[PDB]
Amino acid sequence: MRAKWRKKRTRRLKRKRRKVRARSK
């Protein structure tokens, strides 16, 4: 697939992980 989309996907994932770790902390 396209790097633009892999990057977008990854950014959304980083965001989600950030907020759930915020729940923990």
Partner RNA sequence: AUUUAUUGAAGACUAACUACUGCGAAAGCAUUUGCCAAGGACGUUUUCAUUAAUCAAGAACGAAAGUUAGGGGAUCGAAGAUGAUCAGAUACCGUCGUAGUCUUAACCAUAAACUAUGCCGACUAGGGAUCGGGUGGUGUUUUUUUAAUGACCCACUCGGCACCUUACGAGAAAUCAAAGUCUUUGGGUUCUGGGGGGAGUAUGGUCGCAAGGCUGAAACUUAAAGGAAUUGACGGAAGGG
Partner RNA sequence: AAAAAAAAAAA
Partner RNA sequence: UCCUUGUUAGCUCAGUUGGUAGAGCGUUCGGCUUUUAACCGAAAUGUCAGGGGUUCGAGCCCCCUAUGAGGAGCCA
**Residues making contact with RNA (CB under 7 A):** 6-7, 10-15, 17-18, 21
CA atoms within 13 A on the CB side of 14: 6
- Smallest gap from Cβ 15 to RNA, in A, equals 5
Which C-beta is closer to RNA: that of 18 or that of 23?
18
Rg (CA), the chain: 11
- Smallest gap from Cβ 17 to RNA, in A, equals 6
- Smallest gap from Cβ 1 to RNA, in A, equals 10
From residue 23, alpha-carbon distances to 1, 2, 17, 18 in Å are 32, 32, 10, 9
